[PDB]
Design a binder for this molecule. Structure first.
Ligand SMILES: [K+]
Ligand SMILES: [K+]
Ligand SMILES: [Mg+2]
Ligand SMILES: [Mg+2]
Ligand SMILES: [Mg+2]
Ligand SMILES: [Mg+2]
Ligand SMILES: [Mg+2]
Ligand SMILES: [Mg+2]
Ligand SMILES: [Mg+2]
Ligand SMILES: [Mg+2]
Ligand SMILES: [Mg+2]
Ligand SMILES: [Mg+2]
Ligand SMILES: [Mg+2]
Ligand SMILES: [Mg+2]
Ligand SMILES: [Mg+2]
Ligand SMILES: [Mg+2]
Ligand SMILES: [Mg+2]
Ligand SMILES: [Mg+2]
Ligand SMILES: [Mg+2]
Ligand SMILES: [Mg+2]
Ligand SMILES: [Mg+2]
Ligand SMILES: [Mg+2]
Ligand SMILES: [Mg+2]
Ligand SMILES: [Mg+2]
Ligand SMILES: [Mg+2]
Ligand SMILES: [Mg+2]
Lengths: 193, 148, 99, 203, 51
RNA sequence: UUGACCUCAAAUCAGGUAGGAGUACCCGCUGAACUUAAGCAUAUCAAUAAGCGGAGGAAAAGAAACCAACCGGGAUUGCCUUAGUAACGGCGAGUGAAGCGGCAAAAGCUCAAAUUUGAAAUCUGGUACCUUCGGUGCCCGAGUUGUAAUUUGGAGAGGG
RNA sequence: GUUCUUUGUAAAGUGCCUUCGAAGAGUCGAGUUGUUUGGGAAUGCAGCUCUAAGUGGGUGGUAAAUUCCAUCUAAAGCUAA
């Protein structure tokens, strides 16, 4: 069944594929149900914003390390520097991630800053008090947006020192390539009988 | 839709456009890519040379994010500047207060040198640059600042 | 180990201000633990050697550490485990009569 | 306490003392029934590690399981298929002898819930296991919030569904690239990968 | 002397010998249980004694 | 001779519990061949049908012996992607994931290994009463071959 | 929301110094066999043989020796959407 000039196709339908066909007829019904569940959860929970405050965090994998995004939870170091304990932050609506570590002062500072902003912008009700109705806002993420850090200014002075960036890249690659060979060569030339 | 198909037109015509001698049988040449080396060899070698065999070396667990490096040619190099600022940067082509372009922020990994840019200094920040791209930037009076 | 600030080469990557996070208590899962050192020493005293450990000691004393390490790599899984076991065995030998 | 010494000593299985105890105990277990109630754990430290507590409601059962491969039960070795399936004698039963032990013990004590099990002995013919079971009807277990989770009906015959330690191991339930086939369930992953997803607005 | 899984006490003479603690292997976990108001005790120690 | 202990029994002993049905979905075991390869044996169909064991309202998974190699992410699940790609394959027919990224939902934790040792502080049951999904007193019993409190690696403990 | 209950010199959290810091074995791992996987000098699983350690152990998708580095912390457990 190889006819005239057409691309080779790879349609994987040699199993009983018709027994597993998910047609999402319930896309609209599920959207309605999700909105209903969000409304019911908002009504059920305290005048609390339906989601926890998340940290700012650098994406891995240089394809994405140029950008910043919401992480799972604030590190223990970040919570301590913001002046809370992990248990109390979890009770007042802060996501806490024991797994994440701080090796970047800029990200650590941004997270401590947004923790301080959140603490200043929330009102914690007393356990046995009155705390008059505080007009629940639904999105901590919308209240505290994640902002991409500004790396440079719009305009600057040209400072070409004659380094030839292409040559710099070539030399860095070559030096990495021949680092081990040169180290072995120096090791063998350090014989000194 | 069905009312526009040729099968409506074949109603009343016995063979349904499939012929009397060679009918519409089930799989006369085999199923799928059967016989690519034996009875479909001509249609394989023509229109698909190179199909059979191996051509290089394998790469277990290859991740495409390692090789992510979108290329931007010098021919644009200025669509990265917002349109309104572009005119006032093109005018007054000054060595001082030259526009800084973060091509990595724009989503590019290497700057190539296809086109030609105006004689306006630009500070091009990039992970990688083509040799000709860097020389053209320098000839326009700008600089390439390597970033990561 | 500071990044070079460029996208290729040995210490490639962006320069950021480092922080040196506090050491996790994990990364100390296989630590010294005086208590377990005592327990392991006492158990090694009360229960003696395994047959392969005795064979390894004989091989160390008679055929050399290389042959002993070959047999230890056969008995255990890996060469690193064989080396550690032979080191433990000749430490046992040293702690034995030939002080 | 003594449990650290027990744990370290139990690892010297080829020492003289443990070899002697192995021989005597394997003879005794072989003389007893294939499945029989054990008065107390033979390895109290291991039982504690696996979740046993010395309170009313916790039960220990010793079970003997035949060793070796799973011979294909086809008559006269005839498989009536392609030669790739003609094998009879080197087929391996993708489930542990420990799992067989817990399943048989759970069928015996169906009023209990298999919490765990551990190896105690073996000979050429048999492998010997002690199964820790919990009585979900006993009030000491229904109270004691540390253990009344096993009283929930969702935990009926967890050993039969592969929810014990050996069951999760055999099902391949672990994290990482080595368990891509079996992380969320092998058949569930296969269904998800072999499902054709069609949206209202086709993509 | 009759601890049925004996590993619970096999290390005890050597532990006592290494720590310089006088020890006696004695007949009866049941007897030690009578000592300490239990059915069986498997050990019984004196740390302080009256003058 | 008496009283224990250990192990093992018996009772229409006191009180309970299992089985069977259903089985769309779910967790496992076992397990084809038709079929495709224009023949066919590996392969494919398919880790499917049939067979067997076991649940729930969901199940399973689940708080990393993870992913990564980054300026690092951070339980699990699902969707959109990655991708018909890396890879597998009489490298033939065919097969074929995963990391990242956007999103839905978000939630975290607990035992073992510790001397309470100036006090088994723990628990089932019986019985009487009570404000009865239970409580209190008393009594047996379980339990030191370890039941409570205390700690779970993010730590944490002991002293000051 | 309102009332009789008030637990309790009980419980919990936090700063600094100091001594420690127990962390799961016929298991991990290895060989071999079978099955399986996209996992390719071997992806998982299972049988049998061997069988660990504690600055260890696992992983790091090409087998191996050597030197490092990174990242987790198995062989026990619960958990809604
Ligand atoms: K034809
Ligand atoms: K058959
Ligand atoms: Mg006609
Ligand atoms: Mg006709
Ligand atoms: Mg003809
Ligand atoms: Mg009992
Ligand atoms: Mg068999
Ligand atoms: Mg009765
Ligand atoms: Mg049933
Ligand atoms: Mg068919
Ligand atoms: Mg055919
Ligand atoms: Mg045909
Ligand atoms: Mg035929
Ligand atoms: Mg079926
Ligand atoms: Mg039901
Ligand atoms: Mg649900
Ligand atoms: Mg569940
Ligand atoms: Mg953990
Ligand atoms: Mg994740
Ligand atoms: Mg594409
Ligand atoms: Mg397949
Ligand atoms: Mg505390
Ligand atoms: Mg562990
Ligand atoms: Mg099979
Ligand atoms: Mg676990
Ligand atoms: Mg579970």
């Amino acid at each position: 069944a190889i006819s005239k000039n057409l691309p080779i196709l790879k349609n994987h339908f040699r199993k009983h594929w018709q027994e597993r066909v998910k047609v999402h007829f319930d896309q609209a019904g599920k959207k309605v149900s999700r909105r209903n569940a969000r409304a019911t959860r908002a009504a059920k929970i305290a005048p609390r914003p339906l989601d926890l405050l998340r940290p700012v965090v650098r994406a891995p994998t240089v394809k994405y390390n140029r950008k910043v995004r919401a992480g799972r939870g604030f590190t223990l170091a970040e919570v301590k520097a913001a002046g809370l304990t992990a248990a109390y932050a979890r009770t007042i609506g802060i996501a806490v991630d024991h797994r994440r570590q701080n090796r970047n002062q800029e990200i650590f500072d941004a997270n401590v800053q947004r923790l301080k902003e959140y603490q200043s912008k929330i009102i914690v009700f007393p356990r046995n008090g009155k705390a008059p109705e505080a007009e629940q806002v639904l999105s901590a993420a919308a209240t505290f947006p994640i902002a991409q850090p500004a790396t440079d200014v719009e305009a600057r002075a040209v400072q070409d020192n004659g380094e030839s960036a292409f040559r710099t890249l070539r030399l860095a690659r070559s030096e990495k390539k021949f680092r081990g060979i040169r180290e072995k060569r120096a090791r063998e030339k350090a014989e000194a009988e | 839709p069905s009312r526009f198909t040729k099968t409506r037109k074949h109603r009343g015509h016995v063979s349904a456009g499939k012929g009397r001698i060679g009918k519409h049988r089930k799989h006369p040449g085999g199923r799928g890519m059967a016989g690519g080396q034996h009875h479909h060899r001509i249609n394989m070698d023509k229109y698909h040379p190179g199909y059979f065999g191996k051509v290089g070396m394998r790469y277990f667990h290859k991740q495409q994010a390692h090789f992510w490096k979108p290329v931007l040619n010098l021919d644009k190099l200025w669509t990265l500047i917002p349109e309104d600022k572009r005119d006032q940067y093109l005018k007054s082509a000054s060595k001082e207060t030259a526009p800084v372009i973060d091509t990595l922020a724009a989503g590019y990994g290497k700057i190539l040198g296809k086109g030609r840019i105006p004689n306006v200094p630009v500070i091009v920040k990039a992970r990688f640059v083509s040799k000709l791209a860097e020389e053209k930037i320098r000839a326009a009076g700008g600089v390439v600042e390597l970033i990561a | 180990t500071v990044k070079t600030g460029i996208a290729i080469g040995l210490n490639k990557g962006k320069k950021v201000t480092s922080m040196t996070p506090a050491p996790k208590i994990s990364y100390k899962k296989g630590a010294a633990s005086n208590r377990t050192k005592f327990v392991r020493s006492l158990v090694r005293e009360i229960a003696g050697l395994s047959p392969y450990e005795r064979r390894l000691i004989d091989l160390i004393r008679n055929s050399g550490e290389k042959r002993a390490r070959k047999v230890a790599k056969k008995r255990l899984g890996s060469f690193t485990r064989a080396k550690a076991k032979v080191e433990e065995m000749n430490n046992i030998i040293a702690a034995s009569r030939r002080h | 306490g003594a449990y650290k010494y027990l744990e370290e000593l139990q690892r010297k299985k080829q020492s003289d003392v443990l070899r002697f105890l192995q021989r005597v105990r394997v003879w005794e277990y072989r003389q007893k029934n294939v499945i029989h109630r054990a008065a107390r754990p033979t390895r109290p430290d291991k039982a504690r590690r696996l979740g046993y507590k010395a309170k009313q409601g916790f039960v220990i059962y010793r079970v003997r399981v035949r060793r070796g491969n799973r011979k294909r039960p086809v008559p006269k070795g005839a498989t009536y298929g392609k030669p790739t399936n003609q094998g009879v004698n080197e087929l391996k039963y993708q489930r542990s002898l420990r799992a067989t032990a817990e399943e048989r013990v759970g069928r015996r004590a169906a009023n209990l819930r298999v919490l765990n099990s551990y190896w105690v002995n073996q000979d050429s013919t048999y492998k010997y296991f002690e199964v820790i079971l919990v009585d979900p009807q006993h009030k000491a277990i229904r109270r004691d919030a540390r253990y009344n989770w096993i009283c929930d009906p969702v935990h009926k015959h967890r050993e039969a569904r592969g929810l014990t330690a050996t069951g999760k191991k055999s099902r391949g339930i672990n994290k990482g690239h080595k368990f891509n086939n079996t992380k969320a369930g092998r058949r569930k992953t296969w269904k998800r990968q072999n499902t054709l997803s069609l949206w209202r607005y086709r993509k | 002397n009759d601890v049925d899984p004996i590993e619970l006490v096999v290390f005890l003479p050597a532990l006592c010998k290494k720590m310089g603690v006088p020890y006696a292997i004695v007949k009866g976990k049941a007897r030690l249980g009578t000592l300490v108001n239990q059915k069986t005790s498997a050990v019984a120690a004196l740390t302080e004694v009256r003058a």
